[PDB]
A paper describes a structure:
Central to the replication cycle of influenza viruses is the viral RNA-dependent RNA polymerase which transcribes and replicates the viral RNA genome. The influenza virus RNA-dependent RNA polymerase is a heterotrimeric multifunctional machine composed of polymerase basic 1 (PB1), polymerase basic 2 (PB2) and polymerase acidic (PA) subunits, that catalyzes both primer-independent replication (vRNA to complementary RNA (cRNA) and cRNA to vRNA synthesis) and primer-dependent transcription (vRNA to mRNA synthesis) in the nucleus of infected cells. PB1 houses the polymerase active site, whereas PB2 and PA contain, respectively, cap-binding and endonuclease domains required for transcription initiation by cap-snatching. High-resolution structures of the complete viral polymerase from a number of human, avian and bat influenza A viruses, as well as influenza B, C, and D viruses have been determined. These structures have revealed that the polymerase is a highly flexible macromolecule that can assume a variety of distinct conformations, enabling the polymerase to perform both transcription and replication that require different initiation and termination mechanisms.
Using cryo-EM we determined the structure of 17 polymerase-nanobody complexes at resolutions between 4.5 and 6.7 Å; this is sufficient resolution to accurately position each nanobody bound to the polymerase heterotrimer. On the PA linker (site 2), that links the N-terminal PA endonuclease domain and the PA C-terminal domain and wraps around PB1, we observe three nanobodies; Nb8202 and Nb8210 bind identically at residues 220–240 and Nb8204 binds at residues 250–265.
Residue numbers in the entry:
A (entry chain C): 1 to 249
B (entry chain A): 1 to 716
C (entry chain B): 1 to 185, 207 to 756
D (entry chain F): 1 to 24, 32 to 51, 58 to 96, 111 to 120
Write the structure that this text describes.
Amino acid sequence: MERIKELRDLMSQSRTREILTKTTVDHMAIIKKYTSGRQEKNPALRMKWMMAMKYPITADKRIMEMIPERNEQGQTLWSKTNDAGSDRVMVSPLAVTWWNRNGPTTSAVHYPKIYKTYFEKVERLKHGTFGPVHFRNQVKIRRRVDINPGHADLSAKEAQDVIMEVVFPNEVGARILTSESQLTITKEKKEELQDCKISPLMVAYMLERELVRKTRFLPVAGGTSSVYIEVLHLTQGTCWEQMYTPGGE
Amino acid sequence: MEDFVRQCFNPMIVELAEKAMKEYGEDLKIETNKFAAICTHLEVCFMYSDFHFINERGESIIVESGDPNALLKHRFEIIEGRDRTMAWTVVNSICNTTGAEKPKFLPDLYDYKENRFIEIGVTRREVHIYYLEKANKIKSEKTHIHIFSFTGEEMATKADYTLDEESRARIKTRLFTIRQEMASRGLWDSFRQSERGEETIEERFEITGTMRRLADQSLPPNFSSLENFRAYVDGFEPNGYIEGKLSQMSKEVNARIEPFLKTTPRPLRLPDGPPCSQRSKFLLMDALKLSIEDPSHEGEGIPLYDAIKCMRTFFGWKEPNVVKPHEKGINPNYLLAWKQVLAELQDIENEEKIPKTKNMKKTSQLKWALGENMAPEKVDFDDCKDVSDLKQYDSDEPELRSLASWIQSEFNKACELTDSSWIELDEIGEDVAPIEHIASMRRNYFTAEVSHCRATEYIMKGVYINTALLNASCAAMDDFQLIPMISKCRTKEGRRKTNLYGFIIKGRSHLRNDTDVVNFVSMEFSLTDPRLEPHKWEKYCVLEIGDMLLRSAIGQVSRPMFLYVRTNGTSKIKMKWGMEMRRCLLQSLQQIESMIEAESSVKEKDMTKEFFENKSETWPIGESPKGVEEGSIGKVCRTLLAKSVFNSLYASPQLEGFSAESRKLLLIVQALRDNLEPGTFDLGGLYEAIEECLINDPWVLLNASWFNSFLTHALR
Amino acid sequence: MDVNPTLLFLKVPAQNAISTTFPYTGDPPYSHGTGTGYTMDTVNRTHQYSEKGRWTTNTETGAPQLNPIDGPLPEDNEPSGYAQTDCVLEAMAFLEESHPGIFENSCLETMEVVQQTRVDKLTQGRQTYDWTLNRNQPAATALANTIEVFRSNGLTANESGRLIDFLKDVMESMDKEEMEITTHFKKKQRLNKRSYLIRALTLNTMTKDAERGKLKRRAIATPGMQIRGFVYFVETLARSICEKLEQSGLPVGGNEKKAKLANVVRKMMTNSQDTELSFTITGDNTKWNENQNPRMFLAMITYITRNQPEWFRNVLSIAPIMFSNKMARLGKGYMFESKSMKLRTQIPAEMLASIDLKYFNDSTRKKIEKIRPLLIDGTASLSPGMMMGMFNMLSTVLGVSILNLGQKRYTKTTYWWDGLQSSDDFALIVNAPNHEGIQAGVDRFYRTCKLLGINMSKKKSYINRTGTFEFTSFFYRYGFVANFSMELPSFGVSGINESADMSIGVTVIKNNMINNDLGPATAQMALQLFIKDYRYTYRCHRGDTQIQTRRSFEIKKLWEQTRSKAGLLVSDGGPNLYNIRNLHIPEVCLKWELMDEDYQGRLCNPLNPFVSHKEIESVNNAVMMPAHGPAKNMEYDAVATTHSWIPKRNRSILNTSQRGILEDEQMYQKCCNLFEKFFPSSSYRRPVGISSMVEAMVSRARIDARIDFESGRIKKEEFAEIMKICSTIEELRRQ
Amino acid sequence: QVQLQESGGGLVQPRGSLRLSCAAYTMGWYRQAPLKERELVATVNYADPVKGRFTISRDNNKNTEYLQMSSLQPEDTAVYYCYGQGTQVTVSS
RNA sequence: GGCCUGCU
RNA sequence: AGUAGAAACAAGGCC
């Protein structure tokens, strides 16, 4: 109901009507990236400079109807002045902390299921067992190794169709996945995330990260396993070796 | 033939078919019979779908015209007449909502009663072959298929015909209308067989017009056209042309190697001129501290109250008077500014609660001291052209200045220990691995070594001052603000303590660019008389403000106590980089830990404890008139920390240029000392490159003097 | 006793303590005003290194151009751009012979990419010079403006959605009598043929800031949008070629560079017997970009693309053809001050052609006098050579050809050489039975380099015995030695947001521990200092302290409200549990089991009004410009929390005549959000097609209402309402 | 003897004149200014700073090149070499 | 005096 | 004045 209604409201005004009519689907990306905002050259300097202002961050308009304009002593939490090229409003950082102490609460039980990679890292490290540190010269030789320890033996494009069919089943188009490994992955990640309401985009991004294999060139000495490379900073050094066995093994 | 589609069919269908024509990118002028055939297919699709509605029952309600109501459901909903992306969108949506099977090709319609697809195709040939043809094109299909053909016959599997027969009479009447209208036209010489499935195209990227002429002007000197040059390139083969030109080329074009020996390198020449002055934003070696011995932590507390309490701890105030003038400004303004600061500090002391941040009055004194309303007003060139004085901004090499001995002593005392701990580090996760325990022990050793160091005190001073200045500039852009220089340490006894070096008055700070300058005036207490090294205080105005009595065995000194007052400035980039001075600790201690690890790779054991306690091994860390002096690892730590701190304090382009062009020569000298037969192509050029970076910066000149001393001691 | 750190090198070798010689703890040098002086100096220097060439006047642009190719051979060691066509063609032929099938294959993959590439690939770029407004703007904005102008002028082939079609339209625009542009102050202005040619062939010049390692500032250039597609295709070909060359090091990272350097040094020295001596030259090329003539790149590519479809050759040749006629905008201008009348003025650079020279100093006066003859419509012709490393990969190809030309099969002498080339820098290992052989080999290598327009910087180069050398701030001494002073500037708060900054800092510490041999205790100290700076920057202190800030009240109440305070994030004033073992774990997941369910739910709430995600590309990618290197992107692990807000934008557009761009931004974003709600996959996979917005949106409304009734919330009343509302918007679009 | 021996230098007031001789193919007179490099002055062709002031000549029987210096300036204050010991020329008031 | 902006 | 260094800041524009 609503969606077509703001569609009609947009088409009511002449300029947006023209934009909707003359613009083709292919140009979607271009106009979506059409912005006057330059990409910052020195982000640290301005982050250290903007945070000294009042209302340094930006938030959706809806914040004006969930968080009061001021806190107990009267420190303002949000302003009604919109951003430069968006309908979002500039708000103070307190509106963040306020949201974490009296804002609406939900059931975050499914975030562990979504962010599978990070929670698997935590579980692997929690059950790890350290050993003695041995001091001897390490011959670090540079090798190509896979960093992602949960890659399902799929490439970027190869798993992209799987990700769409898992999250966006209707926009798949011609592709119907042939490999049965992809079939089982789709089934599992479909039944697992059937009602998760985090965001389609973040779900797709994390599925891409988990399933897609990624490789990088690093100086290693021993190890060479996927689980042993994520902790390469902790097990191998310039003149010391720290024996380690992740919780998985 | 196109006249037929001009005449009969309605607009809607003809533009739908024209967009379907554009879909796959073939042109309509070459073969139009496909257009007519598929537009008739689309027409039968409509005429078969429309006029057919359903209500909550099955048994579709058929109405010649949809009456105004909510009961406008369509019996058959069309697939084609849409783009491939949307056709597959509808296919997938129907499959996911109806729980049916996904076909591999494009259907034409969907129906509810039987909950499935219809692929309508009316071909010229008779049905009973085209049907099974498209059937074997589609794999294991449950979608029912139904086709007509011009003779008027119908067929389908399951003997199934999904709706009214009068509609099918409609279809075949439409069909024979088409047929015996072409009869008047006469198209069957090709109508039965006009499409054979042609798909081919050649990509054409032709250079022509102006862009061709440009191609004719981007060739070697003796070529006339891109065609000729490409023909020559294709016909070109290697026939020893590099050798001919190498032989013909003059022999003066050479890269002769000049041997680099011990007697080759000469000392770097330093610029000559007036002595070098002080550039720091605060006093480093001549600072004085007024303290309260409070239990508050670094960030804990309120600045103004702490400053006032510290200043009340000192007795012996005198009416201030000029001792050493600025030599270029109006010292009475500095005097009046100091008295104004004192008066307003008392004014705060009187009232109820000390404000967290105070704003000062904009008197003419600080208007001059902070450089207010001095930027020339911006105008247009068309209005100022006849002014003779109008010229460019002064753009020339900076003034030349010779090195002085004060920077050496300042660095010397910047590496000395102190009676306080100037670093209170944060918390880290409790160490769980033995390597983490080793790291923590190493870190504790280095913290014990460097915390009691003037370099750490300078780091904290700079970080706090720049943080406060940046925050005040970003908050109080318009109005002058008072900020007391505060630094909190911990005594040997363990009691925490605060220290007040002085005050900073920040001025207008409407900083847009990263290079825009915010001006402030800094006042700092000290005991060092400025009458002994005046050239180091060229830009300072120094007053006499009191007398101090520090307990000494020579009765009690009752020394004078002066106020160094100056106008300084910074910028957003400078403030940001000065508030990250704590990475000097990193740089230094990373270097020391690299030393320790490299040495421990030799002996298979951690070597930190004996390095820091036994102090047997020592590194050359300075030269005395007797000779080169070596110090323990802790002294090396402090020296490197001081070097990094001074790099962060006296940073400038001269420093970067000299560092690079002297690292080159240092590598060459190291190669010489390693017996690697080093050689150079133009050493004089490298020397000139190094010597052009030394202009007026005390730090870079001191580094150059150190480099000359290292060369003198090396090469032996 | 006087302390002197440099004397430390008398006991510790120079490379083992080279980190001390990198003053990367202070503010790097920045430029303050115009870059016009540097642009003029660079143009004059590029034109006078090729003075002995031949002059011509382009019949299209009417600008003077200097062709030095096949010019007189140099007779001195000064820089020279007199490259010889036959010599370079022979070098490329030998490169092909030593690597058969390189050019044909690379051309095949490049042809595939060019004929399947899309227009949107041009949006994935940083600032570009929009000619519609004569100023630098984001790549997407400039592309959109150029497409709009083309469509308004009648060039609508780009509607095919293919980059090749966009380039076809671009070339067709060159043959138009009169184009039209829009300006706001809206006014429609007409550009004739020559003016549009110069506007499409021009470059925008700026001054490079944050450049560490030199006393003087330099100038850099940014091209337009008409020429970026050809550049993209040419660089794709060059990258595909260099990926097949082991002597190149430009298309790889740092660790790969080190590995290849070690391999080449071991190969050269190990194969050398006791009789052969080995020497390493640590060479830098003076005026690398100013001496590379685009015509020679045209020759190299036309030799590479031999026996290939003519359209491929044409599309790959268009780029150097435009660079050979490239123009450069002088810059911002010059600012004058009058102290007698106490005023300042800013004259644009376009007046340099006619403005009197009384206001300029001697140096600038002479520079303007020398560059004036080349001024055409406020921009200077820069035909002789490249401006700033636009063809990095082709230059690397030429250098690799030079390196391979001494494989001992072409030297025809006992001496031989090899090494590694990365544009403007190289390491050359030369072996020969005697010092005379080494001298002859280096002399011939230098001479051959001078025949290709490449000069070796004698002042910044030195030769020693193999085993010790330098390459791009990587010091090799019997094995590469860590520096850690190049990455020091990256140890602070990045400046993206709270969660992003935390993750980026911990990940940077981890990486520098893995690669740059950062010590354990040093890493712990870095973690402590980073946490301190992070808390002091975001006003998020431990909460149990009495540090009054603008955010210390809410943080303190959250602290007192929470029961398990160990689960609070550092952003919310909680303890830091990070350590050397936890540097690879996001903060949210490390504290997940310690958080209270109420705070956990409030933190990670999808409905939070702070989190905003635009595209799959910008989810967890942060662009950090590394010190002493080109802009780079990093993947940082982070959980989408309420702290993932995006900061405020500039907001200064409101005072400029270009104020309508914000309204267009808002309307485009509203339409894009509506489309995304209609097409959820719009962000992850960019939609493709040739239909218009409203068609897809209305038709999908039809179908989705239908099916969501066939099972879902919709009702007949609502379904029919949607159907007739779709009809209403249909008839509205009709009129 | 040695291989090269320059002679005839000295102190001269600006505008003054001097004749340098050298006892040693095409030969050239070079000068090295204090702090600066060894630069070509003339050969037997003249450098632009020299122009119509200095005149190089040679006696092929006596194996010697000569440099006649006229209208001398403080920029010619340098050690002059042929190609030795060199000969110091200093122009001053 | 009143109001706008701080990488456009 | 001061910052800074091959050109700039020492607020800008709009009424």
